[PDB]
Design a protein around this nucleic acid. Sequence first.
DNA 1: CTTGACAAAAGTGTTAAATTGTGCTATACTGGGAGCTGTCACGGATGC
Lengths: 345, 56
Amino acid sequence: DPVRQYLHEIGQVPLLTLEEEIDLARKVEEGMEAIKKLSEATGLDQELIREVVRAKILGTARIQKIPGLKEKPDPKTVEEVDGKLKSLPKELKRYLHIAREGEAARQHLIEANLRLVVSIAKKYTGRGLSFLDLIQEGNQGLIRAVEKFEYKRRFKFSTYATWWIRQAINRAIADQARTIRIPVHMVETINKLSRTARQLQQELGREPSYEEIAEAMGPGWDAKRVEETLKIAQEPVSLETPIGDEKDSFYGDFIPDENLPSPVEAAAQSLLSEELEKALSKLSEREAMVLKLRKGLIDGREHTLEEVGAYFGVTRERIRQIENKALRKLKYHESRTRKLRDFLE
Amino acid sequence: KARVYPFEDDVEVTTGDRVAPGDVLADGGKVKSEIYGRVEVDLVRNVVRVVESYDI
DNA sequence: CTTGACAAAAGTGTTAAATTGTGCTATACTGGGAGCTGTCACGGATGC
């Protein structure tokens, strides 16, 4: 059972005292700024030796071994760096070790206030992610708040962390939610609208008409706007939805397939094609061939008057009147024969 | 459960590193740890300790 | 079938207005949560 699993996995470590908290933040920031001063040392970048710290701390080669087929070169961009600062005097080395212990501190910190995250996200169930899923995204929120927090602020880390938790959570549900992808601002305005609708549904003692709720919103909000975003609201309905009073009556197999041709349609198209194909020979040998271009027959792509004119060596005007007389000669044969009179839709 | 090997100058190794008997932890090739374990470097107290840990 | 003229359909270039994606908020928030029933037969893994 994967749920109660993490439930006992979090309580495996104590949370923290104020002391431990401040100490954690202490060695964290001192470590990171040590990485800064280290960036001034061998000329390395700010973020470079940082992730390199993860290279020799978070484990052996397992870290960058499989981050997709492309993340960042291990034997090239990492290896030499790991050996470039090994040659360096006491100062740069002490800064090194400071970096190591600092990042580790970041980790421990994260786990405690991860217990915290667990509670917070535990209150958010039913967003389309049952428990862990939700929680996990929520967790990473704290992570971003871990590096952005300062012990100097004299605030319990729980506060900052919490707000960032609700951040990660709401962004995650905004980006996942219904099966149809929806933009973040869009989701915002959605839950905004439904908020209002809820409120004045309870106040008015009844459900609001489109115009009064849309008015309750503000400027530019009308019945059509709410009706619109309401149409977008509802998600795709599952095909596996059983209908009727039985189990065996399904939904998915009740949908017609019009995206593909039908036998009647296949023979219909083949028919128009053939019947018109033989109706072709009764036209002037030149004007028929020309007519195959202007109407987009030969290669499927319609050729302009200029092109067909560039074909028979005649001006485009010629091709034009050619089309007039051709289509009308055909018109005689049609109005007479009454063979192709069908296909009138 | 561990064995302390306090150094003097710089260090050869880092925090987190596997060693075996007959290795030089620090001290420019002076101090030598005899046991298997993950070496941990404590800056302030100036010591590199070998906890008894097999890399597994 | 032909030349020039010209209306509209169409092509292209540049912007304004909309849509959409991102980051962050500091008192303190630090181990979920919901229940459900009135078989039956046999085959297999597993605990006696």
